[PDB]
Amino acid sequence: SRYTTEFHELEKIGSSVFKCVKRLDGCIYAIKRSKKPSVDEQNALREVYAHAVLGQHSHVVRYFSAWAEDDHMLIQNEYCNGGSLADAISENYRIMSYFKEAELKDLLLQVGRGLRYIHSMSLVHMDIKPSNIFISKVMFKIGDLGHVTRISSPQVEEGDSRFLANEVLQENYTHLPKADIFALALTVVCAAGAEPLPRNGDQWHEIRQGRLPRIPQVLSQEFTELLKVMIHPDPERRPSAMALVKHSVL
Numbered sequence: 001s002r003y004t005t006e007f008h009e010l011e012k013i014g015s016s017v018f019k020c021v022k023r024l025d026g027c028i029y030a031i032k033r034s035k036k037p038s039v040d041e042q043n044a045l046r047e048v049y050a051h052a053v054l055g056q057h058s059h060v061v062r063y064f065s066a067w068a069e070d071d072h073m074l075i076q077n078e079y080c081n082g083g084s085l086a087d088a089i090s091e092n093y094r095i096m097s098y099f100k101e102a103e104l105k106d107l108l109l110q111v112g113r114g115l116r117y118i119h120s121m122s123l124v125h126m127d128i129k130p131s132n133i134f135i136s137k138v139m140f141k142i143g144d145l146g147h148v149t150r151i152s153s154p155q156v157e158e159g160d161s162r163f164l165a166n167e168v169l170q171e172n173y174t175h176l177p178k179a180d181i182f183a184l185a186l187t188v189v190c191a192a193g194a195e196p197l198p199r200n201g202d203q204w205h206e207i208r209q210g211r212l213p214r215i216p217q218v219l220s221q222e223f224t225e226l227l228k229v230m231i232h233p234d235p236e237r238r239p240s241a242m243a244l245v246k247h248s249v250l
């Protein structure tokens, strides 16, 4: 098998994803091995197609190769040795020491540049959340292109409900880029030290009214006001990724 022959498997890093050394080049890669799926195959192939047009950007995880063997599909991507934002947030949570305002702005700006790049390729990510942001200056890179779709798709697989804009839940796909913007604000909120976001119920709905969850630290008004517009109930009111990256607060 290509996998066994080309790569030395170092360890499992996600449940599968493995940290591997490619034997010829001496580099370390993250390789996802999933069972080969149909509508499910189309969804698997969009991940690959997305990766293969989104390999030029410093804030999107680099793709190297993908292949099929057995009943598995394989994707070999850039290894980010800092883990995901989810783990850094969860460690912060235990130590009661969060991203400070300067680091939240950096997080927001870097990921915002990633979205800006995705969105200019007429693509939307649709699953922005801390577990899909990888850490390599710390560098943040968007990864997990499993929900990537073209921006005017009439059908969307919705991402994690914690980060899901209401209009996407209502199957209104008229402004899909602003769904990524909404999820990015909530991502930054979690990095700021917020409690686990709700999945349904009255707290879920409340955020989708444009009320920011409680943040256990004091932030500038100007920064809080940017995060809050990013979760505006009206997606049109939310900044584009380009407007976000040029924003004076950043």
Ligand SMILES: CN(C)CCCOc1cc2c(cc1O)c1c3c(c(-c4ccccc4Cl)cc1n2C)C(=O)NC3=O
Residues within 6 Å of the ligand: 013, 014, 015, 017, 030, 031, 032, 061, 075, 076, 077, 078, 079, 080, 081, 082, 083, 084, 087, 134, 143, 144, 145
């Ligand atoms: C506790 N923590 C500090 C480190 C332990 C786990 O570390 C990692 C897990 C990881 C990745 C990188 C890591 O450093 C990691 C990467 C990636 C993926 C991934 C997600 C979706 C599709 C394909 C892949 Cl390879 C999934 C990944 N997982 C589950 C990736 O593309 N590039 C990555 O570095």
Ligand SMILES: [Cl-]
Residues within 6 Å of the ligand: 086, 129, 130, 131, 132
């Ligand atoms: Cl997450």
